[PDB]
């Protein structure tokens, strides 16, 4: 109950932590937190605004030691991808990790798929799937006023 309450409190304050992030600090598994999470909402008759990709960009990018410009590009890419519906049904965390990977690969500070997965809590396979969906529209997603250390046409393909 406490772990689920902590998750709700983070959502209600506009700084969501993913269920895995809350689980990593609690002996309770993610499955049980989700079970108590839904029960608490029913009991309290409350609701939490749906999380977005940008709700995790600051924490993820900061935890990855990525510059501010990479974080700004990563936020722009993820929001644009959702706006363009390039990743329908994908979890926002998966999109955020993939967006971070695309922006990271396009800058001097390059982070591997494994690195982003560990901080983001998303398997590199999941990041690979989401990244593959947005890779085709890479030039459109990147911010217009973005400096590419590695040209968009030469981004990793996989």
């Amino acid at each position: 109950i406490a772990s689920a309450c902590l998750y709700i409190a983070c959502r209600q304050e506009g700084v969501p932590r993913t269920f895995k992030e809350i689980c990593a600090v609690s002996r309770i598994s993610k499955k049980e937190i989700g079970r108590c999470f839904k029960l608490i909402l029913k009991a309290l008759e409350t609701s939490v605004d749906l999380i977005t990709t940008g709700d995790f960009m600051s924490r993820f990018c900061s935890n990855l030691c990525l510059p501010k410009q990479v974080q700004m590009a990563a936020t722009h890419i993820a929001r644009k991808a959702v706006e363009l519906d390039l990743v329908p049904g994908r979890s926002p965390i998966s999109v955020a990790a993939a967006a971070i990977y695309m922006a990271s690969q396009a800058s001097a500070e390059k982070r591997t798929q494994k690195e982003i997965g560990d901080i983001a809590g998303v398997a590199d396979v999941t990041i690979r799937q989401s990244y593959r969906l947005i890779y085709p529209r890479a030039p459109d997603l990147f911010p217009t006023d973005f400096k590419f250390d590695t040209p968009v046409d030469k981004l990793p393909q996989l």
Partner: protein, 222 residues
């Protein structure tokens, strides 16, 4: 003559030996090879009314050690050895004590400083860290200890309700081993549900109040 007997023959012969205090570097050089059978020569010079003891380091070993004697009348010292075959013997009695000192004074401290620095290598100090650690409490769907325990419980499964006759036979058979059993311990032996086991135990067994630890079940119905 026995295993614990001490071969005091050395004492009978009144053999004399010298006790010498030497620094580690001199012994460390000896410990380097320690199998060549030679580390130096001990030179003793005596005059009409004065005696001096000095030691010279081997040239190969290096790639003056003056000796100062000490009075031995204030304490009596003896040397004994224990044989690997459990045969203790007395080598002899110490007749003189000597100490080794370094010929050099200034540059000698330099070697000592290196030793002090060398012995300071295991001395661990806190390390400043440029970037805050971000690898702790990494997101995880479930802790490794939790899934392993969950997997074990699933594989083992819940205990089943065995027939009363088989459960009764096991209970009576185990009764011979000890007079009384704890309910928790008895469950492990019988491997039956607690509620089901309690009902069977109640049907025949009873619990007696013991003033030493607590009231425990007694397998004897009467």
């Amino acid at each position: 003559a026995e295993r614990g007997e001490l071969d005091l023959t050395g004492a009978k012969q009144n053999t004399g030996v010298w006790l010498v205090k030497v620094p580690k570097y001199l012994s460390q050089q000896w410990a380097k090879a320690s199998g060549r059978g030679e580390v130096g020569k001990l030179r003793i010079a005596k005059t009409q009314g004065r005696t001096e003891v000095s030691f010279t380091l081997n040239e190969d070993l290096a790639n003056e050690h003056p000796f100062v004697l000490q009075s031995v009348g204030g304490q009596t010292l003896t040397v004994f050895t224990e044989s690997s075959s459990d045969k203790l013997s007395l080598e002899g009695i110490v007749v003189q004590r000597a100490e080794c000192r370094p010929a050099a004074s200034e540059n000698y401290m330099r070697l000592k400083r290196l030793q002090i620095e060398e012995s300071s290598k295991p001395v661990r100090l806190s390390q400043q860290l440029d970037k805050v650690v971000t690898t702790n409490y990494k997101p995880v769907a479930n802790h490794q200890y939790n899934i392993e325990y969950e997997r074990k419980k699933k594989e083992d499964g819940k205990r089943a309700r065995a027939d009363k006759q088989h459960v009764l036979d096991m209970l009576f058979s185990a009764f011979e081993k000890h007079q009384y059993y704890n309910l928790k311990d008895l469950v492990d032996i019988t491997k039956q549900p607690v509620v089901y086991l309690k009902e069977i135990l109640k049907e025949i067994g009873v619990q007696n109040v013991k003033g030493i630890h607590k009231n425990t079940w007694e397998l004897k119905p009467e």
